C-alpha cells in the first residue's frame, strides 16, 4: 500500500500520507517491519494495541436544543437552527460529514416601520394609508401575535433647485403660488417609533399632510438609510423580523445626484436624526449609494419592501435586484389586496432559506445537499425556496480539509441569511501523536545525543 | 509609469474653500505654463461663500497662489418695466474651469437669477453663469445663456416647455480648438439637461457690464424633449469634444447623461448641431455611467477613442453579491464611418466605495512609446481609502488592463484626492507631459512631474 511505499521517517509523516494510515510506536517490533501501515497489518505483526496511533475523523454535537414549535412568548429563547454547536475533528486530507436543520418558526415577532413619501405628487396616493394601522394589524394578526408598527415621512433635500425658494412665502408654504396650502419642505422626519398601539399609528397618520418640491425624483433613499442606522429611535427589536416598507409614486434620487445642489460629500452611513426627529445632514450630505444601502440593511437585518405605484413598478423591480432580499409590491386600487401586499411580501420573505458560511478557513472546503419540500434531495444546493411559515428543512454538509494547517484550533459559523440563530462548528486538526508529547530530546539512543527519540524512531534534532 | 512620486509640488488655498475642486493648465501669450485652480467655496466680500479662482505660476516648490479676481457683487437692473436680479451667494464660482488660448473660463453653476414684474416673478433659480478672463490684458466678460425674462405664470400655461431656469450652466465646461465654449447644463429643460455653445470671441464682444440680459446671435443651445427616457437624465453632467465622423472640418461633442433612461445612464456623441451620431448606454442602473468622459487616441490609429466612467458600478462577486467599486469603459473608434461597438476594455475598481472612474484624464504620451496613456481616479480608493490615481498605458490593442503606476494620496483622509485631474501638458518643459491632481477636500493641488523612463 501507499503507507509503506512512501518510506516515512516519523509518525507525523505517516498520518499525512493518507487518512487510512496508522503508526506503531512499539518497542518490540520485528527486524524490518514498516511502522507505517494499515491498522490491520500492524496488529497482524504482534503490535501492542496501545502502541497503535490511528486518529479517526469524528463529529459529535455539543449543543442540540430542539427546534421551537412556536416563536411566540418567551424572552427570545426561540431555537430555529439545530444543532447550535458541534465539535469537528479531522486528519490530513480527510473529510467528515454533518447535518444542520432550519425552521421558519410560526408566530415570530414582527416590526414594520413605514417610510412614507409625502411629496405633493402623493396627494392622490394618501388613500392607501388612511386607516393603515388597523388594516395593517388585522391581516398580520393571522401570522404573529407580537406586532409593532412605526411610521416616518420624507420628501427631498430641502434646498434649491429641489426646493422652491421664492417668494419668501414659498418657504413656509410651498403651494403659495397656487390657491392651496401645504407643509414646508422637509428631508426626512421620524414620526412614530415602533409600537404595539395601533391606534397611535392611525392617529399619527391622520395628522400628516403633503409638502411640495420641484423635481419629480424624491429623496426617499436618504430616509431608508436613516431608518436603518437609527436603531434606538426607530425601535427595531433584537429578536424580531424587521420590515421596512417604502411607498412612493415617483422615481428616486441616487448617489452623485446631490451635486446639482452643491452637495458632494459622500453619505457616511451614520445616524443624523436628532431629538427633533429630523435628518440634519439632509442638505450637507449626498444621497446613499445602493452599495451602502445594501450594507446597512444587511447589517441591521432589515427587509426592504418597495410598495410603489404601477407606473414605477418596473423601475423598483430593477433596483430590488441590485439589493438582494428586497421585494416589490404593486400599490394600485385593484389587486389581491393593496396593503395585504405587506402580508404577501412577508410571505415571500419567509419562503426561502439560504445558508451562509462565515470564517471558513482556507484549508476547509464545504459541500451541501439540500432537502426541501418532501424529502427531495438536491445536491450542490444550499438554499431552499417555496417554503411556508412553519416548514423545516435540512442540509447535509461535508468539510474537506486540505493538507494540515498551522493552527490546530479553528472555528467557523454556518448561519441562514436573515436568521438570529446559527451553527458553530468547532474544528480540531489532529495530525500528531500522543507519543510526541513524551519524546526524548538529545536521546542516548539517537546518534549519541545528536537526535531525538520519539514514537520509536530517531529524529534529527533541532539545528541540523 | 514614469511620473515622479517622490518629489511632488504642492499648491494650497484658503481653508474650507475647496481649492482644487477643478483645475487646468494655462499658457499665456508667451507659452509660459501656469495652473488655474477653482475654489467654489472661497469667501466673498460679505464673508459668504461665493467661490474663487486662482492662477498658480509654475514653481518646483509651489505654495500660495494669487487670485484671478472677478466681480462678486449681486446685480440689479430695472428695465422694460421689470427687475432683473443676479444672486452670487453660494454660486460656486470655480466649480469648473477650462483654459483656451490666453483666455480662462470659470463657471458658477449655482448662481441664482430672478425677475420681478409687479407681484409676479420668474422664480429665483440656479441658471448658472460663466466668467471669462484674459489675465494678460485684464479683459473680462460673462456668459449666462439660461437667463430669461419669462414670468412663472407663462411656463405653467406652456406646460413647462423650454424651461431653462435650472440649467446650472457651467456644471461642466469644454472649449473646441476653434474657440467655441461649450457649457453643460444638466438642469436645463426641467432636468433633462442641455448644452450651450458660443464663440469665445463673440462672448467677449457682445458683453457689457450692467446689461444682464444681452444677445449672443452666434450661440447655439440643444433642444427640449417629451421623451420620458430623457427625464432627469442630467444631460451635460460631463462634456468633451473630439473627431468622430471623419470630416475634420466638423467638431463632434460628447455628452454624459449619468441618470438617462431611469438611471440606466448613457453618453451620446453629437455633431455641432446636436444631432446624435452614437449613443452608449449604461451597463447597470445607478452606476452613474456618464459621470465622466474622456476623448483621446490610445492605440495610435489617429482616431480618437472614447472613455466613459461609471464610478458607482457594482461588481459581481462570490455568493451572488455586489461590490461598489466603479468602472471605466474603453471604446475604440472603428476605421471609417462605422458605429462604435461593445467596449474594447473594461477596467474595474478594487477598493469598495473607492469610486474608480470618477475622473479620467488623457496624459498624452507619458513614456514616449508612441501610444497615448491615461490616468484614472478613485478618490476614496487605495488600501487606506485616502484616494488613488492609476496610470494605464496605450498600446496597439487599446490600453493595458493593468496599471503601469499607482499614485497614493499624499494628503489625509477625505481629501478627495483625484476628484479632478489634468494632464498632457509639460509644465516644467522637460519634454515629458505632466499631471496635476486636485484634492479639494484638503484645499490643495499636487503636481506630478514626468521624468525619463528608468527601466
Amino acid at each position: 500500500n501507499i503507507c509503506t511505499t512512501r518510506g516515512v521517517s516519523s509518525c507525523q509523516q505517516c498520518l499525512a500520507v493518507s487518512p487510512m494510515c496508522a503508526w506503531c510506536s512499539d518497542e518490540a517490533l520485528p527486524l524490518g517491519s514498516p511502522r507505517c501501515d494499515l491498522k490491520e497489518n500492524l496488529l497482524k505483526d504482534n503490535c501492542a494495541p496501545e502502541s497503535i496511533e490511528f486518529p479517526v475523523s469524528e463529529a459529535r454535537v455539543l449543543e442540540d436544543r430542539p427546534l421551537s414549535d412556536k416563536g411566540s412568548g418567551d424572552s427570545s429563547q426561540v431555537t430555529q437552527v439545530s444543532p447550535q454547536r458541534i465539535a469537528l475533528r479531522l486528519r490530513p486530507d480527510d473529510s467528515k460529514n454533518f447535518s444542520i436543520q432550519v425552521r421558519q418558526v410560526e408566530d415570530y415577532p414582527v416590526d414594520i416601520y413605514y417610510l412614507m413619501d409625502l411629496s405633493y405628487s402623493m396627494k392622490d396616493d394618501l388613500w392607501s394609508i388612511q386607516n393603515l394601522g388597523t388594516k395593517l394589524a388585522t391581516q398580520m394578526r393571522k401570522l404573529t401575535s407580537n406586532l409593532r408598527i412605526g411610521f416616518g415621512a420624507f420628501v427631498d433635500k430641502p434646498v434649491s433647485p429641489y426646493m422652491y425658494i421664492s417668494p419668501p412665502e414659498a418657504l413656509e408654504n410651498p403651494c403659495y403660488d397656487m390657491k392651496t396650502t401645504c407643509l414646508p419642505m422637509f428631508g426626512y422626519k421620524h414620526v412614530l417609533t415602533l409600537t404595539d398601539q395601533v391606534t397611535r399609528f392611525n392617529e399619527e397618520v391622520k395628522k400628516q399632510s403633503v409638502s411640495r418640491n420641484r423635481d419629480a425624483p424624491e429623496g426617499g433613499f436618504d430616509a431608508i438609510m436613516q431608518a436603518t442606522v437609527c436603531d434606538e429611535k426607530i425601535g427595531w427589536r433584537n429578536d424580531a423580523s424587521h420590515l421596512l416598507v417604502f411607498t412612493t409614486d415617483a422615481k428616486t434620487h441616487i448617489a452623485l445626484d446631490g451635486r446639482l445642489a452643491g452637495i458632494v460629500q459622500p453619505n457616511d452611513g451614520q445616524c443624523h436624526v436628532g431629538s427633533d426627529n429630523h435628518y440634519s445632514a439632509s442638505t450637507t450630505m449626498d444621497y446613499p449609494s445602493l452599495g451602502l444601502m445594501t450594507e446597512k440593511l444587511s447589517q441591521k437585518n432589515i427587509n426592504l419592501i418597495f410598495a410603489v405605484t404601477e407606473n414605477v413598478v418596473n423601475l423598483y423591480q430593477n433596483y430590488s435586484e441590485l439589493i438582494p432580499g428586497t421585494t416589490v409590491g404593486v400599490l394600485s386600487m385593484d389587486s389581491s389586496n393593496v396593503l395585504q401586499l405587506i402580508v404577501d411580501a412577508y410571505g415571500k420573505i419567509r419562503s426561502k432559506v439560504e445558508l451562509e458560511v462565515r470564517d471558513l478557513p482556507e484549508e476547509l472546503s464545504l459541500s451541501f445537499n439540500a432537502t426541501c419540500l418532501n424529502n427531495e434531495v438536491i445536491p450542490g444546493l444550499k438554499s431552499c425556496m417555496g417554503l411556508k411559515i412553519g416548514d423545516t428543512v435540512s442540509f447535509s454538509i461535508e468539510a474537506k480539509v486540505r493538507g494540515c494547517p498551522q493552527e490546530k484550533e479553528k472555528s467557523f459559523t454556518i448561519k441562514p441569511v436573515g436568521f438570529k440563530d446559527s451553527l458553530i462548528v468547532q474544528v480540531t486538526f489532529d495530525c500528531d501523536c500522543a507519543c510526541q508529547a513524551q519524546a526524548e530530546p538529545n536521546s542516548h539512543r539517537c546518534n549519541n545525543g545528536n537526535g531525538t527519540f520519539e514514537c520509536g524512531v530517531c529524529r534529527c534534532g533541532p539545528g541540523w | 509609469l514614469n511620473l515622479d512620486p517622490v518629489q511632488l509640488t504642492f499648491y494650497a488655498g484658503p481653508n474650507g474653500s475647496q481649492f482644487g475642486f477643478s483645475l487646468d493648465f494655462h499658457k499665456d501669450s508667451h507659452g509660459r505654463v501656469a495652473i488655474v485652480v477653482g475654489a467654489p467655496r472661497t469667501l466673498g466680500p460679505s464673508q459668504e461663500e461665493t467661490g474663487g479662482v486662482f492662477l498658480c505660476p509654475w514653481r518646483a516648490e509651489g505654495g500660495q497662489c494669487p487670485s484671478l479676481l472677478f466681480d462678486l457683487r449681486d446685480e440689479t437692473r430695472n428695465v422694460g418695466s421689470q427687475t432683473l436680479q443676479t444672486f452670487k451667494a453660494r454660486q460656486g464660482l470655480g466649480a469648473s474651469v477650462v483654459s483656451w488660448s490666453d483666455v480662462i473660463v470659470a463657471c458658477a453653476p449655482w448662481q441664482h437669477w430672478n425677475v420681478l414684474e409687479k407681484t409676479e416673478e420668474a422664480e429665483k433659480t440656479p441658471v448658472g453663469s460663466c466668467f471669462l478672463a484674459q489675465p494678460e490684458s485684464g479683459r473680462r466678460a460673462e456668459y449666462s445663456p439660461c437667463r430669461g425674462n419669462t414670468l412663472s405664470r407663462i411656463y405653467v400655461e406652456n406646460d413647462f416647455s423650454w424651461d431653462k431656469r435650472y440649467c446650472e450652466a457651467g456644471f461642466s465646461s469644454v472649449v473646441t480648438q476653434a474657440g467655441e465654449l461649450v457649457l453643460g447644463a444638466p438642469g436645463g429643460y426641467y432636468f433633462l439637461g442641455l448644452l450651450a455653445q458660443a464663440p469665445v470671441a463673440d462672448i467677449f464682444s457682445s458683453y457689457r457690464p450692467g446689461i444682464l440680459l444681452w444677445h449672443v446671435s452666434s450661440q447655439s443651445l440643444s433642444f427640449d424633449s417629451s421623451n420620458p427616457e430623457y427625464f432627469d437624465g442630467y444631460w451635460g453632467y460631463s462634456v468633451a469634444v473630439g473627431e468622430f465622423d471623419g470630416d475634420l472640418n466638423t467638431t463632434e461633442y460628447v455628452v454624459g447623461a449619468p441618470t438617462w433612461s431611469w438611471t440606466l445612464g448613457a453618453v451620446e456623441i453629437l455633431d455641432s448641431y446636436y444631432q446624435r451620431l452614437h449613443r452608449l448606454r449604461g451597463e447597470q442602473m445607478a452606476s452613474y455611467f456618464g459621470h465622466s468622459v474622456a476623448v483621446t487616441d490610445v492605440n495610435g490609429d489617429g482616431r480618437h477613442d472614447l472613455l466613459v466612467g461609471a464610478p458607482l458600478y457594482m461588481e459581481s462577486r462570490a455568493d451572488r453579491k455586489l461590490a461598489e467599486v466603479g468602472r471605466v469603459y474603453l471604446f475604440l473608434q472603428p476605421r471609417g464611418p462605422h458605429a462604435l461597438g461593445a467596449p474594447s476594455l473594461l477596467l474595474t475598481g478594487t477598493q469598495l466605495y473607492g469610486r474608480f472612474g470618477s475622473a479620467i484624464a488623457p496624459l498624452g504620451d507619458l513614456d514616449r512609446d508612441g501610444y497615448n496613456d491615461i490616468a484614472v481616479a478613485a478618490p476614496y480608493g487605495g488600501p487606506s481609502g485616502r484616494g488613488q490615481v492609476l496610470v494605464f498605458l496605450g498600446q496597439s490593442e487599446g490600453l493595458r488592463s493593468r496599471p503601469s503606476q499607482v499614485l497614493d494620496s499624499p494628503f489625509p483622509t477625505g481629501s478627495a484626492f483625484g476628484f479632478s485631474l489634468r494632464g498632457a501638458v509639460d509644465i516644467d518643459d522637460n519634454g515629458y507631459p505632466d499631471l496635476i491632481v486636485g484634492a479639494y477636500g484638503a484645499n490643495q493641488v499636487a503636481v506630478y512631474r514626468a521624468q525619463p523612463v528608468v527601466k
Binding site: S121, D124, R214, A216, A250 | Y190, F191
Partner: peptide, 6 residues
C-alpha cells in the same frame, strides 16, 4: 408634469 405633482 415632469415635476413633483399628481
Amino acid at each position: 408634469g415632469r415635476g413633483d405633482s399628481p
